[model samples]
Target: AEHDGLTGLLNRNSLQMRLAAAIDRVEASGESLAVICIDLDHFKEANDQHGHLAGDALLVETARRLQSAVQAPSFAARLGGDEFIVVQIAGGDQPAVAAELAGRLIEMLAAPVPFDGQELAMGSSLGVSLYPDDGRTAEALMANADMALYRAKESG
Candidate 1:
């Protein structure tokens, strides 16, 4: 396949290209965008609980859940481990709307999954930053989101 074999999510290199596409979209028509960085809160707890399948199951289910969290215009990626980033084109979305999306994500992503006879108690924290409000560049966007994400993780 032309994608990440396991999760089927875009790989890091591909994500770079996709990010460049997002930037081009912004520069072309003046559309704004949002980037949200996410980290699963209890991955170690799930992994340490012991069966190998359990850990694999968590990762797989999380990949599915992340893809589920997106709208067609939106894109999500597994940046590795419990880390991932979501790209949301501004699409006339308001600041409140983006905030609402993040709120919804933290709530929804905490959903538990039943896997290999173990309950997956995964939790997530995310930080969001806007295109113009944060940065027009992907690197800048990621940096801003990373800061916010760390703050969210710390506060939690």
Candidate 2:
């Protein structure tokens, strides 16, 4: 019920539950939780230049890369279109963890991904938000991360 039809990751409808669960862990144990909002850059061009199949293929590969990038106790999700979310738990060095993960994701997604006998190059812009600093709840955290994503796209 909480799954995306295409990617098999969690769906937006379950974002609050996932976020609430993360908050509960931090509250009970003093562990830290972090959130990332990721958007694929120039996705429309793929659709326009190639086709919808190419676009869908790119999105699927994007989801797979995101899944690989996550460490358990952490999770990733598809937020519709080319939008995505990653939630990670770090007991310490939360910002460092976010930076490292963001860097890796930025690098990984920058490379050309394989699709239907061709290589499709995809770029990504990532935005991060930390718990207790960015927001105390899921909605707020998501909003802040989204705003960060907005800035990322603006500058790049």
Candidate 3:
């Protein structure tokens, strides 16, 4: 129930609850966490250009890469559509750690996905918001991440 049907990643419901838990840990331990909001570049165009199946492949590939990119003390979730989120619990140098992860995601996702004998190009943009500095609540962190995402889109 907590998994996304398409990507098998955490669904919106799980993200909401889990994010709250991560926040609680941050509050109790005085640690820093980051919420990275990610969006695929030109996902709709890829769908229209190739087909639904190609689009599906892109989403699956993204999920696979996220699973590979994230490890314990961090997690990835699908936030519906072409959007995804990563929660990172970093005790030191939050900005450096978060940015490093974001760069890795961007680079990893840029590789083309093979589907139906065609290579579907993909790219992703990420926006990060740090806990305590950004917000103390799940909603606030997510909202700020979304705002950051928008800015990333604009600058790109």
Candidate 4:
């Protein structure tokens, strides 16, 4: 299956193919595309503290939130671990669209998840890169997004 076994989101290889295809579409249509890299905040600590069941539940819930957050022409994927991606394909006002999407993702992921008569504090950090402005090729876009995510994680 192209989907992740754990989260039912697009697996890494599937996401690679779709990202390349999306870049081509953006080139042809003259529209902007955005690649947003996401990481669950302090997930490792929570996983260690709460154990596997709680960790799996958190991952599953994150996938659900990501799936619901994206709309038509945009999609979310799981890149293993607590990392995820949202690719935004749009025409005009691309930056605003990316920013809005990023904000929504952070907000949705920030809510606490209840588990074992307690709450699992959840939050996320996102790094966004746009087409042509950030990079032209899928590789370039992903690399930049990862770098941005690294910096974001470093700060927080």
Candidate 5:
């Protein structure tokens, strides 16, 4: 079910369920899986300054770009607000793929978004976690991703 109306991103409930299923598959096959978490920087500030309609427009546009950036088979969902998650069925080059995804996301957000007759600049922080190597469970993976996200934000 959809939770985010503007972006059409899957809701938290749907995301959790999908993550669980992904874990089950990983456990059964020992195949690797990766999760990437994305957080928009200063998103609240943007909303406060631009208003909710503009904020919603930005999110929708961001989602569109993110969906386009991640070309591999994956699920991209908006956790809530400016947070998003992408889960990919891992291949041999998981780290490279993850990094590439992150870079693409940053590039996508770097472009100015036109909303309500105004062009706005935005940025995002990304965190990545891998199965088997990073953690065996969904919670653990999420925790790692959160940590990485914090690190990404801290660096700036």
Candidate 6:
């Protein structure tokens, strides 16, 4: 799928295709790059408590905020329910930049999302992977990022 119908973010396959080009750029320029994995906390609970509609709204809102928080050059996509990713080319202070984006995503999700006259609280866990250091290839970087994501989820 080209787009996630619920969140409006690009789908996983589309993200993988775009990631190839991003990986190429990193290899060519030797510049630092960041890949971020985002997982919504207690998302299933929201669906169970409120319903699918509320859950869908949360996903869409999360996607919107994530897209807005990062710089223009970044790429953001929804891998599926409660899972999203962002890729950015870093010029300087890559860790700090990634942290800031993660913070924004957390803050954006912290607020209550209103849907169908009900309000639901939400949170997110973030994992970041850097280019060259983390991996040289797209698959490698994505795999590492996923590992980090799982760690964050477990810790949270």
Candidate 4 lDDT over 1-156, as tens digits, reads 799999998888888889999988888898779999998886787789988888777889999988887876888888888989989987779889788878888999999888889888789998999998889888898889999899888886
lDDT of 6 at 127: 85
TM-score of each: 0.88, 0.94, 0.96, 0.94, 0.87, 0.90
lDDT tens digits, residue span 49-148, model 1: 7666666677778789878878656787777777778887765655776887888788877888897665888888898888767887788888899999
Local accuracy of candidate 6 as per-residue lDDT tens digits, 70-155: 65567788887788898887676777867777777778878877778877777888888888788877788788999999888788
lDDT of each: 0.78, 0.86, 0.89, 0.87, 0.77, 0.80
Ranking by TM-score: 3, 2, 4, 6, 1, 5
lDDT of 4: 0.87
Model 2, C-alpha of 102: deviation from truth (Å): 1.1
| Deviating ranges (above 4 Å) for candidate 1 | none
Candidate No. with top TM-score: 3
Tell me the lDDT of candidate 6: 0.80
The collision pairs in model 3 are none
Pairs that clash in candidate 4: none
Candidate 3 regions exceeding 4 Å error are none
Give the Cα-based TM-score of candidate 1 against the true structure.
0.88
Q: What is the lDDT of residue 19 in candidate 6?
A: 79
Q: Comparing candidate 2 with candidate 6, which one achieves the higher TM-score?
A: 2
Give the 10-residue window scoring lowest on summed lDDT in candidate 1.
Answer: 1-10
Residue 131's lDDT in candidate 2: 88
- Candidate 3 per-residue lDDT over residues 1-156, each given as its tens digit: 999999988998999899999988878887779999999996898889987888889999999999998887788899888999999987778889788888888899999888888788799998999987888899999999999999999997
Q: In candidate 5, what residue range of length 10 has the lowest lDDT sum?
A: 66-75
- For residue 120, model 5's alpha carbon misses the true position, in angstroms, by 1.2
Q: Higher TM-score: candidate 5 or 6?
A: 6
